[PDB]
Design a protein around this ligand. Structure first.
Ligand SMILES: [Mg+2]
Lengths: 123, 144, 258, 187
RNA sequence: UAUCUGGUUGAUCCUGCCAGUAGUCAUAUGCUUGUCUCAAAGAUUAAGCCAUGCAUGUCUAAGUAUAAGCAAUUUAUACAGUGAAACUGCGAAUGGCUCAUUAAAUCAGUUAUCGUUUAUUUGAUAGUUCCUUUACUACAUGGUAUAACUGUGGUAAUUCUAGAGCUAAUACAUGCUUAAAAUCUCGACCCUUUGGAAGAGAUGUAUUUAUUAGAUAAAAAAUCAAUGUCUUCGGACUCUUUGAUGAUUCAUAAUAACUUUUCGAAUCGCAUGGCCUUGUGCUGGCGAUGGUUCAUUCAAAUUUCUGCCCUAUCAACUUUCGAUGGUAGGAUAGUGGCCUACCAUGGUUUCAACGGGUAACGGGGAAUAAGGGUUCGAUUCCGGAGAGGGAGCCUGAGAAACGGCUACC
RNA sequence: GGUCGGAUUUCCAACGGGGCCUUUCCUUCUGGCUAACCUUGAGCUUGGCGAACCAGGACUUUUACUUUGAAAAAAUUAGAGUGUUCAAAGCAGGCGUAUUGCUCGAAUAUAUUAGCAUGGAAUAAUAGAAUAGGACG
RNA sequence: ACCCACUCGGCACCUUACGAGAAAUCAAAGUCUUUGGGUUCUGGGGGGAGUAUGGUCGCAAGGCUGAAACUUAAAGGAAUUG
RNA sequence: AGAAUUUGGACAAACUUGGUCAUUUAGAGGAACUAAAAGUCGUAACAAGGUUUCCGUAGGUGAACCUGCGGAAGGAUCAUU
RNA sequence: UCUAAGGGUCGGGUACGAUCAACUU
RNA sequence: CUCUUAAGGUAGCCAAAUGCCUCGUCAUCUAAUUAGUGACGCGCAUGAAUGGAUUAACGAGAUUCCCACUGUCCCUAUCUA
C-alpha cells in the first residue's frame, strides 16, 4: 500500500541471435567507440527506434496539425540540442534516418577523445 | 379497459385526500384530481373524464415520471393494467466491425386512459418501483 | 462499508491539490464542511503545499490553535477544514488576505486581495424555499443560509455577503452577457461572458459561453458562476484572467522571457 | 430475522439466485402488532437513526373526524365490522388501517346539539343567534342519522396502528357509506 | 520495431504439422555473483491448523476528584497546582488482510430518489412550558442511586465477583421563571334588530388523522340573495394575497382535534467592567458543551440503460410452499410479493432462457503486437464479500460487527 | 519584403463557409427590444415587419450513420519542461547585489462500447392522400 | 420434311491462354496480396476413431449426434527419372 | 422499578433417516487399441498383383478375405457414320 | 364455533329483486 | 498329418430342473455358506418348432438375500371359554 515506482527497461535484443552481418557490424561500433557490451549498443537502437516511432506517426498526420507542430519541433529541438541532429536538418524527415551511431558520437566517452586529452577511447 | 367496473375490488376505490362534500350540490358530481406528467406528454381526455382510480396512473395517481424515457412495441398485453414491450437495438462487436440484433423485454404499466394492442408503438416514462419488475409507466401511445 | 470512511489514500485525492505520489500513503481527508470533498483546499494543503509557511503537519497544527489563520472571519482551528470556491482566508500576521480562485489550468491559486476586498464574498444560490412560519431563504454554494432575501433573487443567482453578518448587500441576476466564472468541467477556471443558454427541459441545462478572445465553449449550468457584468467583475480576478491560451502558444510565451 | 431484500426469491426469468451477502441489518422486518381493543398497551420500538416507532397494542380509543362537519372527536371503539384484506381480522377484532369499525358516537351528539341544537335520530338568546346563523345545514344525509339512533356510527380507520401507535379515522359518508352498507347488509 | 529456417523424395513443386527463434513487470530451479539507485515477496497446494508477544483507546482553561497520591498556592476556610483511579462523553462500523462465495450476481460507464435514513461538521433556527396556569412551586435553583474508595470473603484459575458503609454529575431523574399585540371560540346584560357588549379560554414546537388555501392567456355587461369596507345606503370599488418545478396531494399556511408527549439550557473556564435609591441590588464580554427543525457536508440504501468466459452429450423454465400482475393491509428508514388475504394466469426462451463447468471477486490495468487481435488481472487505486461453517442479536447515526455477544457443528 | 530571418494591405489563384433569386415555408400565436427601422430632423432625426434576445402556446414520422462538445477518478500508456552527475526515476526547479528577496511550472494527448446536447442529411430503413372522417379556410 | 440466316433456352464438344492453379488441368477451378456481389454447409498433421459412453430414431439390421486416454514425425497430393 | 421462570409466533443453527446429482475408486471375467520381438499360418493390396480395384448392403469362411445385388473410374477403354 | 365457493323457479317498453333447497369440497 | 461318417453339433447357452467326478475353479454375498448370484467351459450325457437364446406384465409355482416385524427361539410365564 504505497505509490508504485514507475520503471522501464532500456534495451531490446535482436530477433536473430546468430548472423554474421549484425555481429560483425556491432563489433565495429564497440571498438570504434569503446563499448563494453552489445547492450551498450542495443540501448541506442531502443532509443532511436522510439524516436523514429514518434516521427513516423507524426508524419502521417496532415501538415499544420497543432499536435504535429508542437511535438515535431520539441522532438527536433531536443535532438538538435544534444547535437545528434544537425542544425540544417530540421524537417522532421532527417530525424527518421539519422544513423545508429549518431547518438553514439555524443557519448562523453567518445566526446573526450574528440577534445584530445585521452589519445584513445579506452583511455 | 371496458371501464374496469371501477368498484370490483373489495375495498372502496377513491382518490386519496379528495373529498366531495355531500352537504352541498355542484355540477361534476364526483370531484376529480388530475395532473400533467410534463415533458410535453399531454393528459388524455380519458384521464380527465374517466372514472377509474388506478393509483399508479401517471396522470391521476400518486406516481411521478422522471428519468429515462423509452419507446418500444407492445408484445404482451395479457396482464391487468400492465403490458410488456420489447426494445430492439443493435450491438457492436469491434472485432468484426459489424453489428448484431438484440432485444430486451420491459414490463410497463398502462393506465386505463390508454388502450394498447399487440403491435402498438408506445413511449414510456420511468417511475418509482411499481412492482417486482415494473419501473416504467405508459405515457403516450402513437399508433392507430 | 459499515459506516463512513475516515481515511483518504493518495492517488485518490483530487488532482488539483498536486500532492506528490511518493513520500506518503494517505492524503488529508477534508472533514464535513461547506464544500464537497472533491472540491476543497483543505488548509494543510494550503499551508504546506501552496504557501510553504510550514513543512510538516505538526507546525501546520501549531499555527492553527495559536489563532493566526481565520477562514471568512472565523478562526477554524482545524487541520482539514474544507475551503472551496472563493473563500476569504485572513492571516492576522503580515496583515495579508487571501481569496480562493481557480487558475487558468483549474487548480486553486494563491490570490492576494486588499483588506477592503476581504470584507465581502459572493455565493451562487442553489435553492429558494419557504422556511418554517413562511420565512423565505436562500442557500448559496457554501451552505450559507440567508433568511429574508430580496424577492428578485431566483435560483442560479450570485449574491454578495458582508463577511460579518449573514445579510446580503447586493445580487446579480442570471442572463446573457453577464460575466461568468467556470467551476468544474474541462473548462474549469475560465471567465466567459454568457452569450445564450439552452434549456433541454428534463434536466442538465446547457449554457453557451464565449470568452474575451471569441474561443467559444459549452459548459453545464451546474458549473457556471455569474460574477458580474461585462468589463469590471465583482471580485479581483487572478493573473491571466482565465483565457486558456493554446498549448502551442505557452511555449511561445515561455521562450519570450527567460 | 425477517429479511426484506430480493437476493432471495427468484428472478423474473425463474432463475434461482445464489447465496450472497449474508442478511444485512438495513433490510430487516419485524413482527406485526396485531392491535386489539381495550387495555391500551403501546410498546415503543427503536428504529433506524433513533426515531422511536410506537407499536400499538390493545388500543382503546382514538381521534375520529367528521369530514362534512370538519370536526374531530375522541370516541371509544366498539368493534370491527368489515376489513377488505381479510375476514380473520374482523373475527379477532384486529385494528389495522382501512378497517371499518363502529365507534362510541355519543360525543358527536353533544356537539350537534351544541352547534345546531335541533335533534339527532328520533336557552340563552346568544344560543339562538348561533343557531339562526347555522340554519338549513342540519340535513346532511339520511343514512347517518339512522346510525345515531343505535349510537354506533360506522367509520374507517385511516391511521396505521403498528407504525404511529395511534388509531384515527373518519366517519363514513356519502358513497363510502353506501358502498360498505351493501357489503355489510348482504347475507 | 510488416523477416523466417531444419525435417516426408532417387530427385522436384505443394498441403501440412513437428522442431527451431524472440518476449513475458510468468513462476520455479541450476551454475555464478564486485559497485550505486529502486524494488516484488505464503496469491497458486491448505478461506488448512496455530504456541507466544503486540495490533484501540482517549482530555482541555472550559462534565464529575476529600487519593487516607505528589509538592506548593499562601490569591483564598469549600474548590480552583499537578494528578493515579473511577463514573460520564466520544471512538472501537476507520484502518489492515484475504479472494472462499459469486456468471445480469459483482463491477464499469450513465441516471433517479417527486421513493428514504443520515453521528459529525458548516449556516440559520424556540419571548407563547408556574396546569382550576390568585400559594401548587425551588426558580438566587429541585430529588435519587451508584462508581472510585474503606473493610470483610469465595474458589486453583478468567479483564470472575458477594455481602456491608459513604459520596458526585453534562448519570438518572422531575421541574418554572419573559413581553405584548392580533385573531378565533363560547358568551353574561342591555334587548334591539344595524346589534353591541362585560368576562373567560384557545392560539410555540413535536406526533397522528380529517379538511381548506397553495390562483394566475383576454375585455365589457344583465338583474336577481342582501348594501359587502365608506356613503351624496347613487355606488367610486379599485387595495383585494399567493413562491418553485418539466411535472405533484411540493414548500408553506389555516381549521378541528389526539398524544402513556419530544424540545423550548437546574451545565462549565477566564475576564472581571459599568449603573445607582451601596443591595452580595441591577446590567455586562470572550468562549466550551447541549438542544428542535431546516439546509449543507461526510455518507448509506434502493434504482434506469447498455455491457461478461466455456458449454445443447443442457430445450424448454418458473408457478404445490411466490412464479408474473391487481386490490387492501402489515413490515420497513423508506418504493416494491418484501410478507399476508382474496383475485387473474400470468412471466423468460434458438437474438442461447434454464441447467452444468470455471484450475472465475469485477474493473482501472499488464504481456506481445504493422494493422486487426490473442492471453492475463490473488496483488500498491476504486467497488464487493469474509473473519473456522451457519444462524441470531445488543449497543449506536452507522454492524447481522466477530482483536462484540448468544446457540449449534 | 516598404522592418532587419520577422507582417501587412487593392491583388491576379486554389481551398473549404454564410446569405439571396430562379414555381423552392427551411412551422407559428399572445407580447416585450420593436430590430436589422419605408424610418432623414438641415447632413446623425419625432413614427417601419418579434426571436437577431427572450417568457408561455399548437403540433411536432420515426431510426441507423457521421462531425463537434461536455462526461468518462488518480496511478498506468504517449507526450511538453526540467540536473536525479547520465539513466530508470521524481515533479521539481531557476535567478539576484546571496547582506533585504524575485519567479516560471506541476500542461497536454489517449480513453472501446452504453447514456446527453448540437450540425449534416448522401447512404440503408420507416410512415403518409385511394370502398378519401385527405389539406389549406 | 429439308436448305440458308438470326435469336432465346439446354445437354455437350474443339482451339488458345489476357487469367488461374503445386501440378494434373480449368471458359470455370477466371474477374483472389491490385485480397470485400449475396448466402448456407464443412476442414484444421497422421492413428486411436466415426471407436467408447449418453441421447434420439428403427421391428431389427442399424441411422443421426459424438469424445477422451494413449501413440506418432511424418502420413498425404501432383508430376520427373529410373 | 423489577430478576428466575413462562404461552404463542416468526428467524432458524444443527442432527437422524430417505432421495437426487457430481467426482474419484475396487472388481472375477470379456473385448479392443498401441508399441516391441528376425515368432506361427497364409499372400488380401500395389503390375490386367496374376479373379481389375473400390463404395453401400447382406450372408459366409482360420485369418488376410469370398460371394450375391446396385453403383463408381480413383480402369486396363476418352474411339467404329 | 365459524368462513368461502358450487343451484331451481318466478319479474323487465315494442345490470338486478323475491322465494325455494340440496350435501360436496 | 492321420483313421473315419449319412452328416460329424452351426448360432447360441451352461456344474442350468440337464455335469458322474463334484462340496468343479475364480469373484461376490457371511465371522464362518455342500446354499444364492456372476463368470469359466473337451459339455459323463447342452443345443436350435424333441424348438435354441431372450423376455415386460402375470403366478396360493421352486430358490436366495435385505428391511420391517414379531414367543419361532434364548426361556419360559400368565389369563379366558
Ligand atoms: Mg479529516
Amino acid at each position: 500500500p504505497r505509490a508504485p515506482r514507475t520503471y522501464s527497461k532500456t534495451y531490446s535484443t535482436p530477433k536473430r541471435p546468430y548472423e554474421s552481418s549484425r555481429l560483425d557490424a556491432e563489433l565495429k561500433l564497440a571498438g570504434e567507440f569503446g563499448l563494453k557490451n552489445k547492450k551498450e549498443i542495443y540501448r541506442i537502437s531502443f532509443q532511436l527506434s522510439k524516436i523514429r516511432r514518434a516521427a513516423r506517426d507524426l508524419l502521417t498526420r496532415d501538415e499544420k496539425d497543432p499536435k504535429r507542430l508542437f511535438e515535431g519541433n520539441a522532438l527536433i529541438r531536443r535532438l538538435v540540442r544534444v547535437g545528434v541532429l544537425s542544425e540544417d536538418k530540421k524537417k522532421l524527415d532527417y530525424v527518421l534516418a539519422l544513423k545508429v551511431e549518431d547518438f553514439l558520437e555524443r557519448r562523453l566517452q567518445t566526446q573526450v577523445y574528440k577534445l584530445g586529452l585521452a589519445k584513445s577511447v579506452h583511455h | 379497459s371496458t371501464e374496469l367496473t371501477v368498484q370490483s375490488e373489495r375495498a372502496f376505490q377513491k382518490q386519496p385526500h379528495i373529498f366531495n362534500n355531500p352537504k352541498v350540490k355542484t355540477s361534476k358530481r364526483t370531484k376529480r384530481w388530475y395532473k400533467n406528467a410534463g415533458l410535453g406528454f399531454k393528459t388524455p381526455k380519458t384521464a380527465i373524464e374517466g372514472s377509474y382510480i388506478d393509483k399508479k396512473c401517471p396522470f391521476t395517481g400518486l406516481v411521478s415520471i422522471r428519468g429515462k424515457i423509452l419507446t418500444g412495441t407492445v408484445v404482451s398485453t395479457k396482464m391487468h393494467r400492465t403490458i410488456v414491450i420489447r426494445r430492439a437495438y443493435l450491438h457492436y462487436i469491434p472485432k468484426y466491425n459489424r453489428y448484431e440484433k438484440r432485444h430486451k423485454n420491459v414490463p410497463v404499466h398502462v393506465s386505463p386512459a390508454f388502450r394498447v394492442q399487440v403491435g402498438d408503438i408506445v413511449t414510456v416514462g420511468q417511475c418509482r418501483p411499481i412492482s417486482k419488475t415494473v419501473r416504467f409507466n405508459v405515457v403516450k401511445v402513437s399508433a392507430a | 462499508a459499515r459506516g463512513p470512511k475516515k481515511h483518504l489514500k493518495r492517488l485518490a485525492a483530487p488532482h488539483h491539490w498536486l500532492l506528490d505520489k511518493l513520500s506518503g500513503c494517505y492524503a488529508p481527508r477534508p472533514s464535513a464542511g461547506p464544500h464537497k470533498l472533491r472540491e476543497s483546499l483543505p488548509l494543510i494543503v494550503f499551508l504546506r503545499n501552496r504557501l510553504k509557511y510550514a513543512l510538516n503537519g505538526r507546525e501546520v497544527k501549531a499555527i492553527l490553535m495559536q489563532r493566526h489563520v481565520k477562514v471568512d472571519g472565523k478562526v477554524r482551528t482545524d487541520t482539514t477544514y474544507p475551503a472551496g470556491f472563493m473563500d476569504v482566508i485572513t492571516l492576522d500576521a503580515t496583515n495579508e488576505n487571501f481569496r480562493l480562485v481557480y487558475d487558468v489550468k483549474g487548480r486553486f491559486a494563491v490570490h492576494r486581495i486588499t483588506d477592503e476586498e476581504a470584507s465581502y464574498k459572493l455565493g451562487k444560490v442553489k435553492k429558494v424555499q419557504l422556511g418554517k412560519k413562511g420565512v423565505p431563504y436562500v442557500v448559496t454554494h457554501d451552505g450559507r443560509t440567508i433568511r429574508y432575501p430580496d424577492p428578485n433573487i431566483k435560483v442560479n443567482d450570485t449574491v454578495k455577503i458582508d463577511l460579518a453578518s449573514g445579510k446580503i448587500t447586493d445580487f446579480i441576476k442570471f442572463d446573457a452577457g453577464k460575466l461568468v466564472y467556470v467551476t468544474g468541467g474541462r473548462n474549469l477556471g475560465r471567465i466567459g461572458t454568457i452569450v445564450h443558454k439552452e434549456r433541454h427541459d428534463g434536466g442538465f441545462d446547457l449554457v453557451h459561453i464565449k470568452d474575451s478572445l471569441d474561443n467559444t465553449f459549452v459548459t453545464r449550468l451546474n458549473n457556471v458562476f455569474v460574477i458580474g457584468e461585462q468589463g469590471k467583475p465583482y471580485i479581483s480576478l487572478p493573473k491571466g484572467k482565465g483565457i486558456k491560451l493554446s498549448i502551442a502558444e505557452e511555449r511561445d510565451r515561455r521562450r519570450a522571457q527567460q | 430475522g425477517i429479511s426484506r431484500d430480493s437476493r432471495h426469491k427468484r428472478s423474473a426469468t425463474g432463475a434461482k439466485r445464489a447465496q450472497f451477502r449474508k442478511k444485512r441489518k438495513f433490510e430487516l422486518g419485524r413482527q406485526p402488532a396485531n392491535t386489539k381493543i381495550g387495555a391500551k398497551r403501546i410498546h415503543s420500538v427503536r428504529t433506524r437513526g433513533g426515531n422511536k416507532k410506537y407499536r400499538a397494542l390493545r388500543i382503546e380509543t382514538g381521534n375520529f373526524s367528521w369530514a362534512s362537519e370538519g370536526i374531530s372527536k375522541k370516541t371509544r371503539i366498539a368493534g370491527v365490522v368489515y376489513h377488505p384484506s381479510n375476514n380473520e381480522l374482523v373475527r379477532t377484532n384486529t385494528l389495522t388501517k382501512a378497517a371499518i369499525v363502529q365507534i362510541d358516537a355519543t360525543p358527536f351528539r353533544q356537539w350537534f346539539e351544541a352547534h345546531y341544537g335541533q335533534t339527532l335520530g328520533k336557552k340563552s338568546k346568544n344560543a339562538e343567534r348561533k343557531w339562526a346563523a347555522r340554519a338549513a345545514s342540519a340535513k346532511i344525509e339520511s343514512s347517518v342519522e339512522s346510525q345515531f339512533s343505535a349510537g354506533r356510527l360506522y367509520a374507517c380507520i385511516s391511521s396505521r396502528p403498528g407504525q404511529s401507535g395511534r388509531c384515527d379515522g373518519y366517519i363514513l359518508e356519502g358513497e363510502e357509506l353506501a358502498f360498505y352498507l351493501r357489503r355489510l347488509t348482504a347475507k
